[PDB]
Amino acid sequence: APSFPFSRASGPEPPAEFAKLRATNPVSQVKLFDGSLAWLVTKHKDVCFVATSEKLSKVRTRQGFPELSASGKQAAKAKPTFVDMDPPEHMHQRSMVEPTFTPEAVKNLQPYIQRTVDDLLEQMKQKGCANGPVDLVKEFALPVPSYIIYTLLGVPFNDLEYLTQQNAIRTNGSSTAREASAANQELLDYLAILVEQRLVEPKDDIISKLCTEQVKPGNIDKSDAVQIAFLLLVAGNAVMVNMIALGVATLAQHPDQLAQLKANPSLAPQFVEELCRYHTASALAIKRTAKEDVMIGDKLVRANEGIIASNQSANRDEEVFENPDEFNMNRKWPPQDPLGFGFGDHRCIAEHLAKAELTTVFSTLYQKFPDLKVAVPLGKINYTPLNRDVGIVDLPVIF
Ligand code: HEM
Known part of the structure; x- marks a missing residue:
């Protein structure tokens, strides 16, 4: 069994293992840093099942929980918050803070999100780039989600x-x-x-x-x-920063889609949809232990065995997303949800807020700066380390 997590095939790409697993061994065992095993699930249908099955638990004091690093093992000792809870405790606590994040609340927050983006962009303009490039991460991708x-x-x-x-x-x-x-x-x-x-x-x-x-x-x-x-x-927060930076890089990487977005900022929501599918910047959160035996595909997951369900892989599942490794903001979407925000009861509390932040960025950034350019060759972008979730550390731009 191979060591997991896998490393990205390159800066902006998923690990290469997932495509091969989807094709030939979609539910399989991987070895974690401590030598324990876990089941890795790679197909969209199976990721959705793992995310929703009531026979599976997020509680980290259950033996078999797939901790992926020594520090995760240490963190599991603390009193959990709702991220690591099962029903009924999960929604008992999560509901205490959901109101700010509901679709209606986020709709009503849109002017505030827009003002925050506008103000940060104006600071950027005022600052200028007369003496050379500035870092879009420090000046914009970091403060937008942070300040909000x-x-x-x-x-x-x-x-x-x-x-x-x-x-x-x-x-x-x-x-x-x-x-x-x-x-x-x-x-x-x-x-x-x-x-x-x-x-x-x-x-x-x-x-x-x-x-x-x-x-x-x-x-x-x-x-x-x-x-x-x-x-x-x-x-x-760090995921949002990465998604903004990744979006700018992706647009630079596909000039005609940038042209389309500049010509029609109303395309921002569909650009963001594609972005959250293609760049699955939080890929390691859909983890469980089986409370009792559960069959998944052609495998039996036994009680007290761990499971990692890759939403990143699900988002590239050819059976669901045609030409999945193509970035296409004009994608014809199938009925099945993309899983950038996970699935089931634990699905990202902030999904609507995050999409609103991203939509506001991508409907405003090139209106403000129609000539924004990455100021290094795209092949030289400083991505996060390949053994981590996808992201960008810094992104020099001119405008
Ligand atoms: C584009 C940016 C974001 C992406 C891609 C993202 C992705 C995710 C993913 C994949 C999960 C796991 C859901 C599951 O267990 O199935 C998740 C959970 C979560 N996210 Fe996000 N997230 C983003 C932004 C945010 C922001 C802005 C906040 C806070 C303001 C946030 C707070 C949370 C919390 C608290 C949970 C745990 C929910 C639960 O277990 O009940 N996320 N997110």
Whole structure:
């Protein structure tokens, strides 16, 4: 059994193993870093089954849970938040924070999302690029999701830049382990003070609603509110930054689609749909253990065996998406959902917000900067390390 996770075939590509597995061995065992095994599921239909089966569990204290790194093993020791819960605890906690993320709430947030994007773009214009390229990640892809989720949580305007930098440090590949851990703990300490403040004087933000609706009645404690807020910050932010950067790179890579999007920014939603299928920047979250035996395809997954369901592979499943390795914003979509945001009850709480952020970026960026260009050869883009989820570290641009 091969070692898993697999490395990307190159900067912007999925691991090569998945296509071959879909063709010849769609449910198979892989070996994890600790020498344990897990079942890897690669076809769309089977990923959907894993994501929804009530015989499967997200609880990480179950033996057989497929932890993919030594640090994941350590993190599993902590009191879980809803990401690692099963019913009924999962929705009992998740519902405490869903209101901000509903399709209607996100529709009503659209002017705020647009203003945030516009303001960051204007800062970019003002800054200029007269002395050379600037980094689209630092100047734009990082702050857009950061400023939004921090604002929604309740962070005041003046603190956004510093906290945006610190949250990046947690996941920057250049950070040492000490630097990432200290940044982590610094955000938690910050959020704890915010919770203390909003308990005394609530404001119109997510932390305040947790404090008033859940802490004060004793449904959760202060530290739970901190951990729920934290989860909302860290679960999707780095993924959003990568999706923005990947979108810009992809448009540069396919000039005619860029031309089409510039000619018709109303194509942004379909561009974003294709982007979230093609670049599955969170590919390792659909993990389970079997609570009891479960058959998947021609395999029996026994009680206490782990499962990893690759949404990345599902999103390239030729049986569902015709010509799946083609990026086509004019894709004719099948009835089956793309799985960039996962599936089932755990499906990304922020899917509508994320798509709105991406749609706003891709319907605005080239209106603002119709001559935006990646300022290095596309073959020299600095992607995330190949043994990690797809993403881009920095992206020099001119405009
Ligand atoms: C384009 C950007 C994003 C992508 C591709 C993405 C993808 C995902 C994926 C694949 C999952 C796993 C769902 C499952 O278990 O089936 C997920 C879960 C989650 N995401 Fe995102 N996400 C994104 C942005 C966000 C943002 C912006 C936030 C927060 C504001 C967020 C917060 C979460 C949370 C809390 C969960 C766990 C939900 C649960 O287990 O109940 N995500 N996301």
